[PDB]
A paper describes a structure:
RNA polymerases (RNAPs) synthesize RNA from ribonucleoside triphosphates (NTPs), whereas DNA polymerases (DNAPs) use 2′-deoxyribonucleoside triphosphates (2′dNTPs) to synthesize DNA. We identified a conserved Arg residue, β′Arg425 (E. coli RNAP numbering) as the major determinant of the sugar selectivity. In summary, our data show that the universally conserved Arg residue plays a central role in selecting NTPs over 2′dNTPs by the multi-subunit RNAPs.
To test if the unavailability of the 3′OH group was indeed responsible for the destabilization of the TL folding, we solved the X-ray crystal structure of the initially transcribing complex of the T. thermophilus RNAP with 3′dCTP at 3.0 Å resolution. The structure displayed a well-resolved density of 3′dCTP and β′Arg425 closely approaching the 3′-deoxyribose moiety. 3′dCTP was in the pre-insertion conformation unsuitable for catalysis because the α-phosphate was located 5.6 Å away from the 3′OH of the RNA primer. The overall pose of 3′dCTP was similar to that of CMPCPP: the 3′-deoxyribose likely adopted a 3′-endo conformation and the 2′OH group interacted with β′Arg425. However, the TL was completely unfolded, supporting our hypothesis that the unavailability of the 3′OH group was alone sufficient to significantly destabilize the folding of the first helical turn of the TL. Indeed, the TL is partially folded in most structures with ribonucleotide substrate analogs, yet was completely unfolded in the structures we obtained with either 2′dCTP or 3′dCTP. We found that the kcat for 3′dGMP incorporation was only 5-fold slower than the kcat for GMP incorporation and 10-fold higher than the kcat for 2′dGMP incorporation. These data demonstrated that the sequestration of the 3′OH group accounted for no more than a 5-fold inhibition of the 2′dGMP incorporation by β′Arg425.
Residue numbers in the entry:
A (entry chain F): 78 to 85
B (entry chain D): 924 to 1238, 1254 to 1263
C (entry chain E): 2 to 95
D (entry chain C): 1 to 56, 64 to 1118
E (entry chain D): 1361 to 1502
F (entry chain D): 3 to 49
G (entry chain D): 584 to 826
The structure:
DNA sequence: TGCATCCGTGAGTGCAG
DNA sequence: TATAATGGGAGCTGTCACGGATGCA
């Protein structure tokens, strides 16, 4: 959903 | 039109000069508190504790009491509103409130009642009515408490007109988007199909047929085009005829006689013109009390004709219209 | 109201066909200097300037009075468009 | 003249200071006058103690201070600055490891100060911070709208200081918990706090219903710190649940009193609600290693016992005024302050853990600007920072007392239902029920009751006298709506002997319901009728004869009353007209006893008994936000011996110290030949003659001279191609001369600007080659006057740079402002109104010879048509005239208190005493009755106004007592066939004058992308022909007229340019091409990868770009 | 509120403008597919013409909102409401708007097909008899 | 010729390129000194 | 933008950027705010004010509104007489208010002869928020509305304002005079009833003069002979209108 | 298969601003 | 251009009603 927690 | 226009400036001119020399005014002394009032006010309290006792003696409930406390006070309001107008027409028939309301120049019985009699039962914020009515008149003057109680109602109507408007407006825009392409594109689509306007409404009171209200029949019939011959009270109304306002009043009379129950009429529910309607299935250009000119954007007219009233529709109210459209 | 409107609506089959005939004729006159008018100098619409009476400039006032005279023909497919737009620039030049 | 008062109510306390909500609140947030030692942790201070100290190296907070302002209020007003104070804050940095101590006092920027009348100057423009109403911090219970017998519980903190949490008990028996819209079983949480299965029944132990249902040991099979990680899973799908980060999350959501603050109010509310004291404004604690709950179990207690039947577990009326509360200005600005401090700390720790951990100071570890911009922001673009309403001194005072339910932290328009807008039973004596706006904002913006005040917790409360036994004390006490509901409170006007309750029935409310009750049962009494209504509403005489819906317009239109040069206070008043001028801080008074030394159009100096020579100077002809001359005039003469508190100068709309929003005029109430139609008003030319309804107005006209890439802009008197006529009123520099007459077209300031890459084209170079004048390189960019404006140059400000004092936005050399005055007589189109909701537009001005007049030759001033009254039901205006008749012949004014004023006998008595003056004067001056007065009386008798068989004087007497008099049409001398109502009425000029509103355009500016004409008078607009108008033209079948509005008149640039050549040339207008705005539509769909194609009938494209986009 | 039935009818008639298929007979249509009642009655002629089976259909009652969004003209429908849903679906089908109704021509800015703009009246000519007779005489002989 | 319909349909990438006059290579607007458009950017006039 | 996930805001505010679909759609979208209706040239606004002297087909247009709204036409006529040498100098006369000479107004009066303007009032609920009028010039700012048309517009004079629109082509002029002129639009298109019709003062004036007194003095006596009835009334015992 | 349940889309006009 | 440094940070709250597409006993 949240494209930063994804990459994190 | 030309003459009615001149006729109209004419009524404009004289009606205006007369209005001023006539001597019409408003002084506090024109709000005639009829004296029948305190009879009815006294007559109420006794019957009020006439019910505060069939409960004081635990004879029946609060849901029972309230139910009947407020039927008392509403038919009381009726009484004094009457005595206001009886007292006017019998004694001071040239009083300015009476004149103004009676002609249709302003005012109506329920406002005028609140100048002269009592204000009445007021609303509580919820939607329930106060069992205490404000008995003060506007001539007499309200108690601060009466003034406050009376405040909820007005605000709850202020909010009403403000939200509601949004819906009337929105509703109108839908109506235009769904009818706009509808124009009067040809003279006759040759359809052999029609609709039968009833002059009778099948009751459940007698659950027999009773005649329908005149204005309602005028609105199903005025300016239509008969799709079949009709012969009533020796008159012959022919296929193709645009029912004039008199053709209408006639058929109501033929129906009061028993010669007719429903009139076959060329409706646009049955026009077969593509993308529009034809002349016959439409009828008059009501704006001109004559058959409609090919080219009239009827669909847009329709929409403006249905939307413009709702502002202005107080509940169901306008909701029910929307739930239907 | 417009002088003699109820009879205008009587000539046409639909009120909007009057409007188009009027507005068309109205402009035949504006470009041509009225010379094609089918009025006589007493029927001429006249306005009143501060100096004195003068021919009405409003080509529509004209067109409508003209229509009442009967001295005009209305209908569809009566001429080639370009045979008119010069036979008239011939009979009454710009 | 003499002033008769009516009314039997002895009002114990006065109206309180009517700006207190604005002044008390701010000063209580600054404390700029409290010795720092003695300050108190609320407001500006409290924010400091919240954000500090900054944590790993540790930076701590000592104290703050405030300096006086760089410039005084007026100075900032003129120079478009802000009236602010410097904010210094003394800080000590200490090193987490060594003992480092540095200590500086670092400048944080300027805080904007509040003037005496309780407003603000922000970029040199007075503004007001409207209090905000919102639900109040606390815990509430409310029935579930789905399942009739189950109830949600809600936990609400101050806005943006915590999350909302709901406790709906699901249809599976065990209780739920919502946070950031995530549901999960409650027990998991109670575990984390250290809870044991038994200490639950040990505390609930009643409701085997669900006390026993809430328990589910799939969860109990864990220690506290176990479920603690159990839950972090439930709110962070993806974050690794390390026990240093899961404690960090919940703590930072439920116990960290640094982003979770229940109100200070919220503590007390849920405190007394749940019957438990509270350590801090915080749900949970972190004490001795783990979590120690404070609120969740108490809340849990209530909810359950409600869902069975328990006593004292009521739902809550969330619209009650014990559960709604007010964010006054001080609070609202501190919130923004707690947000600058918050950002500033994000940036210190950033430079704490990078840059040098030992050679650092408070000075360079703080960048103030994040604070600066948060303040600047709240004051320059908030929805609660409003351009001040200083139309007249009341409009400014009413503003400061306004209440918005809207705004950041409140409701969006769409959020607003009914219940927020309804009048609440508890508004009684707190929020006026009349003064609200008609339209969308109805019931969101409201006004502060006149006697009401907001307490330290932010609740409105209202005073009531205590009645004990049956006798009424003078001890007044202010109650929140909650304690109010405890008592039986009798009405303001219950009749007394001395201080005992005479009546045997008393008219009282319990919990706002109206009850009839004996004086033994009565505990308190209203203070005054004035305590239920707005300030404006309280200015309305005979309010109790006016329907509510037009008392409301009467209230609001006041604030729109234009200050009149001959303004006068109403001949009928309510007894507040004086205070209002007082607190309006616009009139000018005497500080102590003394004597008047000098007096002058410009200043007033007074020698005091204290030997001081105080010199008050006079704000003479100041322009207000709305253009309405704010002018102070002196009301004492040299030597006048003045006690303390007496008047020295009249403000605007003040006449010897009474609020003068309009003028008293002789009013006749009758149709008048059409010019009365549908609320239009007819007036006597005599009103312009004696300069009634005339008002001074000023418009500022600014211009800037700026540095360009093509040259500088010059403010000159040297403007090419312009005739000495066109310059005769300009000084050598290019400024109009103070004291001139400027009208449309006139240059006020010459300005020159350099010509671009259109330096003359061939067509133009050649044309000048003929005229022996070669291309000039500068341009006339002067500032002219716009259409429909003009006046008398009153003043000019010239700010250059290179001069002292001054420095302007980058790239501007000099700016010039020129203020222009206009005297405005009343005129056909201006709008008039009276305090009863009667409003109309002056439709005709007759010469005095046509005005109706009375037999003794006097002509009426105003003719108001009676058709206005009946349907509007605002009878009070009728009384206002009758008693105004009397006062016009006895030379009297009256004070009729609202709801406690002059009744009908009391005024009919006055109306007789006036009759003798009006007529007896006559029968002695050699004139008897008149022949037309008998013809009228003949008629009046048929009507039934007069008693048949009675002397003319007897009968005229009878009509006079009715407010009615004989009236002669001045066009004929013949009487009005009837007797009319003539009297004296207070009637104001409203801000809505035709001069501000007549506008028209042939052609003008256009819009960048759409090429359609701009909007608004100031842009030289065009008129929006919207969807509904298009429909109109559509319904008529006006095809060509519609097409015109859609092409030639808006954005068919070809045929538009093509037409305005055809008109000027006398040729019919060209048939139109495609609107340039449809093209914009095509290209905007292309830019979405959508291929829109115009096609001829044989289906092959049509280039509506005439090849300009083909290749 | 006196208000002539004919107005409501016109609207209602649009509410009933569409129909649902129930057996495609011998056509490319599909059970459940919705379309204008005109367009199925239209080709059910083309099918009684080539003698094949006719489409079984069924009356559909839509409300006003849906009935406008379902109109043929994607320019009317897009400018109404639900612009992207309207616009995507029309682009996919390469919908070509015939410009039959009013909004369609309002956005293009052409003469609307009503009133003075109605094909029934817009083509009318007006000539004075002293120019109609003028031009009919030369054109009698070649 | 005379517009009589309005077609709307999908843009093939080739077609999008069929429209284009320029690939906007740089995210530059206009030169911070010349105030003229930087080339290969959103206002480049060669495109 | 905004459609999926977070919306792209610029730094230092929370304001979604305006995506191409945002441009296209909504009440402020391109369709509803620029295609189905634009702003327009040759149009003005002002306060309305009742003119009872007006004839049904007329209105009161401030001459200053008139000058601008017809500025092209005035410029030409100003030449076709000679109040200026050419059109461009004619325009510079009317640009500063001092330079306007009296025969400009006689020149305008010439201009608007016969042609009508359009009046619009606030909510155009139906076809008759717009009607057409021959304008007669007037000093002063306010527009003059005819009392008969106030109902259709729902106009009173608590401060209402109205919009003015000059048709331009001979076709638009012919449309307004024939189809949209007030006097031709007397019946409602919704009910077919009349819509221009007496209202507040006008009926009050006629009711008064057409009511009849009913007096109570005589109270219905029985007299056999007129001869004596009069006498009784001359006695003062029986009021003139008693039945 | 029938029915919760979520996601997305609407929510009057013009003028002042 | 070179100590060593290795998974973010702020949610936002009091509308509503309908229509369609999806999940679930
Ligand atoms: N949000 C609003 C507010 C007002 N108006 C216009 O202004 C009119 C409101 O005036 P009212 O006084 O409320 O209505 P009247 O019909 O004039 O009342 P009355 O019978 O007492 O004259 C309605 C409407 O034409 C509007 O369209 N939209
Ligand atoms: Mg109005
Ligand atoms: Mg009204
Ligand atoms: Zn048909």
């Amino acid at each position: 959903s949240d494209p930063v927690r994804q990459y994190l | 039109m030309e003459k009615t226009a001149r006729l109209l400036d004419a009524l404009k001119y004289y009606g205006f000069t007369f209005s001023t020399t006539s001597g019409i005014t408003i002084g506090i002394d024109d709000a005639v508190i009829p004296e029948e009032k305190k009879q009815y006010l006294e007559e109420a309290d006794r019957k009020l504790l006439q019910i505060e006792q069939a409960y004081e003696m635990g004879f029946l409930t609060d849901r029972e009491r309230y139910d009947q406390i407020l039927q008392l006070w509403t038919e009381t309001t009726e009484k004094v509103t009457q005595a206001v107008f009886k007292n006017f027409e019998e004694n001071y028939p040239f009083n300015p409130l009476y004149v103004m309301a009676q002609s249709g120049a302003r005012g109506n019985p329920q406002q005028i009642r609140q100048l002269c009699g009592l204000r009445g039962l007021m609303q509580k914020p919820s939607g329930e009515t106060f069992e205490v009515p404000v008995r003060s008149s506007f001539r007499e003057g309200l108690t601060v408490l009466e003034y406050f109680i009376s405040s909820h109602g007005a605000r709850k109507g202020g909010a009403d007109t403000a939200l509601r408007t949004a819906d009337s407006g929105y509703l109108t825009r839908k109506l235009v988007d769904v009818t706009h392409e509808i124009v009067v594109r040809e003279a006759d689509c040759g359809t052999t199909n029609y609709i039968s306007v009833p002059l009778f409404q099948p009751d459940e009171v007698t659950r027999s047929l009773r005649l329908r209200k005149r204005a309602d029949i005028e609105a199903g019939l005025y300016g239509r085009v008969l799709a079949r011959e009709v012969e009533v009270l020796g008159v012959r109304l022919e296929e193709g005829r645009y029912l004039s306002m008199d053709d209408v009043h006639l058929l109501i009379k033929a129906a009061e006689a028993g010669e007719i129950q429903e009139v076959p009429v060329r409706s646009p529910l049955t026009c077969q013109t593509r993308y529009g309607v034809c002349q016959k299935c439409y009828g008059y250009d009501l704006s001109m009390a004559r058959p409609v000119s090919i080219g009239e954007a009827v669909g847009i007219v329709a929409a403006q004709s249905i939307g413009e009233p709702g502002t202005q529709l107080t509940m169901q109210g306008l909701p029910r219209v929307i739930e239907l459209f | 109201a417009e002088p003699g409107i109820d009879k205008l609506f009587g000539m046409v089959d639909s009120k909007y066909r009057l409007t188009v005939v009027v507005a068309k004729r109205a402009q035949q006159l504006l470009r041509h200097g009225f010379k094609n008018t089918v009025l006589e100098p007493e029927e001429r619409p006249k306005m009143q300037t501060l100096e004195g009476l003068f021919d009405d400039p409003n080509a529509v006032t004209w067109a409508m009075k003209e229509l009442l005279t009967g001295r005009l023909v209305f209908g569809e497919n009566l001429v080639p468009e370009d045979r008119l737009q010069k036979e008239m620039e011939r009979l009454y030049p710009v | 003249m003499e002033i008769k008062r009516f009314g039997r109510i002895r009002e114990v306390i006065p109206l309180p200071p009517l700006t207190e909500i604005q002044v008390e609140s701010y000063r209580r947030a600054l404390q700029a006058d409290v010795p720092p030692e003695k300050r108190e942790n609320v407001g500006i201070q409290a924010a400091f103690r919240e954000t500090f100290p900054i944590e790993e190296l540790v930076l701590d907070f000592l104290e703050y201070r405030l300096g006086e302002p760089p410039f005084p209020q007026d100075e900032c007003r003129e120079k478009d600055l802000t009236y602010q104070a410097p904010l210094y804050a003394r800080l000590q940095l200490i090193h987490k490891d060594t003992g480092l101590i540095k200590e500086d006092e670092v400048f944080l920027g300027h805080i904007p100060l509040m003037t005496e009348d309780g407003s603000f100057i922000i970029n040199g423009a007075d503004r007001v911070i409207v209090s905000q109403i919102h639900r109040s911090p606390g815990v509430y219970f409310t029935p579930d709208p789905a399942r009739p017998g189950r109830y949600i519980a809600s936990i609400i903190p101050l806005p943006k200081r915590g999350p909302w949490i709901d406790l709906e008990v699901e249809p599976n028996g065990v209780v739920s918990m919502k946070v950031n819209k995530r549901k999960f079983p409650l027990v998991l949480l109670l575990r984390v706090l250290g809870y044991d299965q038994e200490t639950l029944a040990r505390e609930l132990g009643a409701y085997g219903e669900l006390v026993q249902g809430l328990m589910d040991e799939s969860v109990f099979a864990m220690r506290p710190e176990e479920a603690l990680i159990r839950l972090f899973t439930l709110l962070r799908p993806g974050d690794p649940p390390k026990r240093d980060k899961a404690v960090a999350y919940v703590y930072g959501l439920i116990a960290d009193p640094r982003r979770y603050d229940l109100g200070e109010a919220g503590r007390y509310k849920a405190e007394e609600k749940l019957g438990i004291r509270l350590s801090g404004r915080t749900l949970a604690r972190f004490e001795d290693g783990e979590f120690k709950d404070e609120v969740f179990l108490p809340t849990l207690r209530y909810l359950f016992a409600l869902t069975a039947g328990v006593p004292g577990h009521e739902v809550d009326d969330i619209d009650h005024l014990g559960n709604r509360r007010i964010r006054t200005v001080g609070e609202l600005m501190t919130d923004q302050f707690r947000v600058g401090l918050a950002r500033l700390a994000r940036g210190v720790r950033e430079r704490m853990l990078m840059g040098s951990e030992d050679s650092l100071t408070p000075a360079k570890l703080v960048n103030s600007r994040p604070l600066e911009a948060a303040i600047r922001e709240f004051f320059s673009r908030s929805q609660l920072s409003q351009f001040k309403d200083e139309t007249n001194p009341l409009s400014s005072l009413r503003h400061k007392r306004r209440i918005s339910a809207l705004g950041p932290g409140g409701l969006t328009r769409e959020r607003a239902g009914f219940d927020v807008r309804d009048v609440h039973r508890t508004h009684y004596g707190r929020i006026c029920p009349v003064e609200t706006p008609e339209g969308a904002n109805i019931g969101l913006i409201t006004s502060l009751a006149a006697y009401a005040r907001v307490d330290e917790l932010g609740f409105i409360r209202t005073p009531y006298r205590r009645v004990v036994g049956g006798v009424v004390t003078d001890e007044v006490v202010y109650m929140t709506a909650t304690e109010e509901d405890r008592y039986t409170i009798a009405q303001a006007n219950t009749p007394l002997e001395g201080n005992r309750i005479a009546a045997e029935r008393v008219v009282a409310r319990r919990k706002g319901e109206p009850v009839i009750v004996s004086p033994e049962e009565v505990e308190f009494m209203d203070v005054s009728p004035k305590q239920v209504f707005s300030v404006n509403t309280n200015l309305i005489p005979f309010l109790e004869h006016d329907d509510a819906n037009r008392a409301l317009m009467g209230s609001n239109m006041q604030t729109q009353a234009v200050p009149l040069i001959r303004a006068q206070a109403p001949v009928v008043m309510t007894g507040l007209e004086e205070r209002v001028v007082r607190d309006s801080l616009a009139a000018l008074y005497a500080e102590e006893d003394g004597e008047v030394a000098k007096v002058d159009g410009n200043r007033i100096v007074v020698r005091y008994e204290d030997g001081r020579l105080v010199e008050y100077p006079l704000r003479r002809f100041y322009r207000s936000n709305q253009g309405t001359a704010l002018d102070q005039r002196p009301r004492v003469v040299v030597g006048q011996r003045v006690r303390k508190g007496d008047l020295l100068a009249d403000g605007p709309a003040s006449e010897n110290g009474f609020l003068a929003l309009g003028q008293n005029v002789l009013v006749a109430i009758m149709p008048f030949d059409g010019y009365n139609f549908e609320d239009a008003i007819v007036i006597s030319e005599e009103l312009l003659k004696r300069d009634f309804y005339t008002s001074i107005h000023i418009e500022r006209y600014e211009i800037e001279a700026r540095d360009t890439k093509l040259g500088p802009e010059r403010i000159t008197r040297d403007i090419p191609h312009l005739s000495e006529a066109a310059l005769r009123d300009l000084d050598e520099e290019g400024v109009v001369r103070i004291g001139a007459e400027v009208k449309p077209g006139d240059i006020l300031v010459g300005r020159t600007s350099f010509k671009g890459e259109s330096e003359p084209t061939p067509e133009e170079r050649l044309l000048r080659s003929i005229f022996g004048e070669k291309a000039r390189d500068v341009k006339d960019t002067s500032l002219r006057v716009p259409p429909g404006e003009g006046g008398i140059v009153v003043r000019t400000v010239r700010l250059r740079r290179g001069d002292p004092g001054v420095e302007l936005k980058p790239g501007v050399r000099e700016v010039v402002r020129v203020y222009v005055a206009q005297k405005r007589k009343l005129q056909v189109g201006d709008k008039l109104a009276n305090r009863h909701g009667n409003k109309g537009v002056v439709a005709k001005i007759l010469p005095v010879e046509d005005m109706p007049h009375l037999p003794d030759g006097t002509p009426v001033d105003v003719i108001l048509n009676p058709l206005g009254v009946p349907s509007r039901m605002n009878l009070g205006q009728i009384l206002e005239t009758h008693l105004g008749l009397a006062g016009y012949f006895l030379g009297q004014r009256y004070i009729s208190p609202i709801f406690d004023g002059a009744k009908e006998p009391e005024i009919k008595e006055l109306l007789a005493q006036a009759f003798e003056v009006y007529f007896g004067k006559r029968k002695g001056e050699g004139f008897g009755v008149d022949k037309r007065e008998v013809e009228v009386l003949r008629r009046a008798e048929k009507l039934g106004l007069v008693t048949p068989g009675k002397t003319p004087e007897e009968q005229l007497k009878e009509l006079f007592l009715q407010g009615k008099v004989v009236l002669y049409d001045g066009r004929t001398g013949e009487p009005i066939e009837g007797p009319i109502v003539v009297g004296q009425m207070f009637i104001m000029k409203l801000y809505h004058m035709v001069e501000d509103k007549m506008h028209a355009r042939s052609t003008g500016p256009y819009s960048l992308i759409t090429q359609q004409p701009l909007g608004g008078k100031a842009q030289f607009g065009g008129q929006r022909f919207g969807e509904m108008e298009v429909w109109a033209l559509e319904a008529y079948g006006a095809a060509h007229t519609l097409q015109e509005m859609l092409t030639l008149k808006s954005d068919d640039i070809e045929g538009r340019n093509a037409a305005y050549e055809a008109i000027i040339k006398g040729e019919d207008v060209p048939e139109p091409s495609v609107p340039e705005s449809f093209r914009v539509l095509v290209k905007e769909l292309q830019a979405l990868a959508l291929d829109v194609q115009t096609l001829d009938e044989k289906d092959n494209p049509v280039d509506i770009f005439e090849g300009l986009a083909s290749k | 509120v006196k208000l002539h039935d004919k107005h409501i009818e016109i609207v209602v008639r649009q509410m009933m403008k569409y129909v649902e298929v129930t057996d495609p007979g011998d056509s490319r249509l599909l059970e459940g597919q919705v379309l204008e009642k005109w367009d199925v009655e239209a080709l059910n002629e083309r099918l009684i013409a080539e003698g094949k089976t006719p489409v079984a259909w069924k009356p559909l009652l839509m409300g006003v909102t849906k009935s406008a969004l379902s109109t043929k003209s994607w320019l009317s429908a897009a400018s109404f409401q639900n612009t992207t849903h309207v616009l995507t679906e029309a682009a996919i089908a390469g919908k070509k708007d015939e410009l039959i109704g009013l909004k369609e021509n309002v956005i293009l800015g052409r003469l609307i097909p009503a009133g003075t703009g109605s094909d029934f009246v817009r083509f009318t000519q007006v000539v004075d008899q002293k120019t109609l007779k003028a031009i009919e005489e030369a054109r009698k002989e070649a | 010729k005379e517009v009589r319909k309005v077609r709307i349909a999908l843009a093939s990438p080739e077609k999008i390129r069929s429209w284009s006059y320029g690939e906007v290579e740089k995210p530059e607007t206009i030169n911070y000194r010349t105030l003229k458009p930087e080339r290969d950017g959103l206002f480049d006039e060669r495109i | 933008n905004g459609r999926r996930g977070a919306p792209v805001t610029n730094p230092g505010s929370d304001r979604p950027l305006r995506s191409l679909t945002d441009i296209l759609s909504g009440k402020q979208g391109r369709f509803r705010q620029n295609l189905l209706g634009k702003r327009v040239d040759y149009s003005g606004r002002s306060v309305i004010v009742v003119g009872p002297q007006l004839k049904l087909h007329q209105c009161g247009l401030p001459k200053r509104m008139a000058l601008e709204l017809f500025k092209p036409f005035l410029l030409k006529k100003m030449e076709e007489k000679g109040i200026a040498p050419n059109v461009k100098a004619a325009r510079r006369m009317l640009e500063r208010q001092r330079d306007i000479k009296d025969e400009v107004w006689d020149a305008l009066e010439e201009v608007i002869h016969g042609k009508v303007v359009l009046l619009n009032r606030a909510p155009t609920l139906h076809r008759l928020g717009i009607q057409a009028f021959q304008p007669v010039l007037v000093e002063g700012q306010s527009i003059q509305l005819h009392p008969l048309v106030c109902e259709a517009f729902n106009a009173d004079f608590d401060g209402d304002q109205m919009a003015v629109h000059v048709p331009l082509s001979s076709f638009a002029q012919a449309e307004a005079r024939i189809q949209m002129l007030s006097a031709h639009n007397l019946l409602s298109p919704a009910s077919g009833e009349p819509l221009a019709k007496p209202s507040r003062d006008i009926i009050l004036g006629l009711y008064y003069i057409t009511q009849v007194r009913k007096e109570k003095k005589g109270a219905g006596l029985e007299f056999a002979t007129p001869e004596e009835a009069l006498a009784a009334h001359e006695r003062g015992e029986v009021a003139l209108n008693a039945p």
